[PDB]
């Protein structure tokens, strides 16, 4: 009954909430018995600034305490781990009727750092950052009830703060960040530099005018991924240039981890924002370029998604294509050519379906003119999961299927293209 985590490969820092305390009163500050009419206070006055974070990791040699702290700083800008100047204090006035007890606890805000790779967690660490306390008030204990003995709880934490799950991607620090210093207009070609050979790397860029862009490597290999720098563009600014604010907190937009899959990105980019492209490890010594192109015509209909180029569709029968599934409400697209000679008459029956995830598809006929690519919407509201409906398409013609995921049942999405005639 595990949630499918449709996260792109990478590092994530997750704020799992505030108000955590350990079991068996390890974080109890103490209890005040306050008599009726009176008041009492428990105070953390920071006469000393020292705090005590707690840390556990699955991998001391990558996710050390230092590294994790650097990640929490990348994600949320946390800078004080060992210290605090933030005071907290709890005050309780007992009612006129009855006596009152207040128990105060130290608390932690829990951060989880994960390395997520191909559908599972491969490195994990938990950093509990000292927080600003928990105060429970209760009626005065009566005599004596009686004392009933109790075994200690297992070691662990109990959350007393509100539910919270804030997921923030972070730049992998082992990878270089290259910059495109000029803001991108209608067209740009980025040559891949030998200073970052073979290793995956990031490209930081920004755009002159808000618009939809197509982005790809030569011959659409390798596949690329694109992220937005969270909170970028709110600050310094220079017309037609990139302003780098060293933001390492990233929101995944679209793109595949499998580098041998041909694809291109179609994405809406804001001029008041910075973006990172990640180019993966390529096992080839040939020169490559990243191409950027502003789209003014029908290709805009494909935002935001990666478009997989399907190449091996040259016989009749069954064909399937497996990719990481987008999350709910996100898109994946497929561009394919119906086998056979294009003679504008010869036709084939085509069945399009998924195996496990539900998705809404729209099918486009593609024709390239001298004015660019044209997309004719020929089929709307296709429900893909175990679809039995079929449609006759032209031999040798080119189609794009755009899929919106609506039910995420499997980490992968498997598109079937079954062709008969």
């Amino acid at each position: 009954t595990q949630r499918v985590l449709p996260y792109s490969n990478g590092l994530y820092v997750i704020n799992k909430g505030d108000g955590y305390i350990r079991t068996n009163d390890k974080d109890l500050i103490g209890t005040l018995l306050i008599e009726a009419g009176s008041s009492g206070s428990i105070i953390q006055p920071r006469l000393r600034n020292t705090t005590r974070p707690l840390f556990t990791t699955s991998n001391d040699t990558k996710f050390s305490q230092q590294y994790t702290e650097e990640r929490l700083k990348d994600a949320f800008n946390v800078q004080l781990f060992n210290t605090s100047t933030s005071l907290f204090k709890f005050v309780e006035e007992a009612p006129s009727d009855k006596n009152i007890c207040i128990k105060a606890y130290n608390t932690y805000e829990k951060y989880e750092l994960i390395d997520y790779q191909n559908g599972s967690i491969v490195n994990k660490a938990e950093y509990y950052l000292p927080s600003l306390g928990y105060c429970e008030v209760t009626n005065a204990p009566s005599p004596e009830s009686e004392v009933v003995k109790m075994q200690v709880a297992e070691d662990g934490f109990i959350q007393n703060g509100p539910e919270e799950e804030i997921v923030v991607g972070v730049i992998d620090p082992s990878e270089n960040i290259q910059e495109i210093n000029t803001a991108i207009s209608d067209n740009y070609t980025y040559n891949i530099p030998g200073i970052v050979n073979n290793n995956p790397f990031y490209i930081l860029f920004t755009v002159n005018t808000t618009g939809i862009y197509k982005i790809n490597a030569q011959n659409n290999l390798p596949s690329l991924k694109i992220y937005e720098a969270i909170g970028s563009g709110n600050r310094n600014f220079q017309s037609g240039n990139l302003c780098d604010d060293d933001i390492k907190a990233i929101n995944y937009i679209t793109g595949f981890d499998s580098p041998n899959a041909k694809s291109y990105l179609v994405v809406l980019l804001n001029k008041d924002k910075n973006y990172y492209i990640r180019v993966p490890q390529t096992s080839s010594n040939i020169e490559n370029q990243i191409q950027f192109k502003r789209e003014e015509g029908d290709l805009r209909n494909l935002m935001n998604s990666s478009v997989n180029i399907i190449d091996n569709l040259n016989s009749t029968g069954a064909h399937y294509y497996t990719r990481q599934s987008p999350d709910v409400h996100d898109y994946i697209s497929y561009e394919f050519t119906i086998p056979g000679n294009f003679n504008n008459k010869d036709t084939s029956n085509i069945r399009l379906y998924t195996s496990y995830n539900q998705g809404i598809g729209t099918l486009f006929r593609v024709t390239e003119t001298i004015d660019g690519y044209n997309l004719i919407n020929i089929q709307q509201n296709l429900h893909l999961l175990n679809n039995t409906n079929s449609i006759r398409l032209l031999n040798g013609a080119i189609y794009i299927l755009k899929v919106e995921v609506t039910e995420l049942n499997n980490y992968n999405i498997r598109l079937h293209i079954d062709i008969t005639n």
Binding site: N24, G30, T31, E35, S38, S142
Partner: protein, 170 residues
């Protein structure tokens, strides 16, 4: 008596917060407030008022007590280096005098040895926690109950607890 439904062996036991100690009740002093005024007393737990009281036994010496308590329950050596304050407020009613006095409270821990459903040995540790004020309105020349001022035997001002973990051998 000292009879307990547990197997044979040694145990750490947390007996709860809120313990006050005999004889010691007025040694921090008190305040006298009058006629509508408010009195506030407090303290600051650091260093040399946070040093704990050990009561070892032939089986259970001080280090054994410290190490077993700090493993299972709160590490008081680390915690009590960091100053924590607490205060209490009392308001005197009009045309009356009020006396309020302060004392420390402690967590009581115990190491017990159990043999044949019987506690045959017990070591005790009191770790300073916070504090507690008692108050009384008084007239000039009014006799006050000794009990208000002076505690003959340790007691818990809250509900006592008995939270246990069995200790396993080196």
């Amino acid at each position: 008596s000292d009879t307990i439904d547990l197997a044979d062996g040694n145990y750490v036991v947390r007996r709860g917060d809120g313990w006050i100690l005999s004889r010691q009740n007025q040694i921090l002093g008190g305040s006298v407030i009058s006629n509508g005024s408010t009195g506030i007393v407090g303290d600051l737990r650091v260093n040399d008022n946070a040093i704990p009281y050990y009561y070892p036994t032939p089986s259970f010496n001080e280090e054994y007590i410290k190490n077993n308590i700090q493993t299972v329950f709160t590490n008081f050596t680390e915690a009590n280096q960091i100053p924590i304050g607490f205060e209490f407020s009392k308001t005197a009613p009009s045309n009356k005098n009020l006396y309020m006095y302060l004392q420390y409270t402690y967590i009581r821990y115990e190491i017990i040895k159990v043999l044949q459903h019987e506690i045959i040995e017990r070591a005790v540790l009191y770790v300073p926690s916070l504090g507690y004020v008692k108050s009384i309105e008084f007239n000039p020349g009014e006799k006050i109950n000794k009990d208000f001022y002076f505690l003959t035997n340790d007691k818990c001002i809250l509900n006592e607890q008995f939270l246990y973990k069995k200790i396993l051998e080196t």
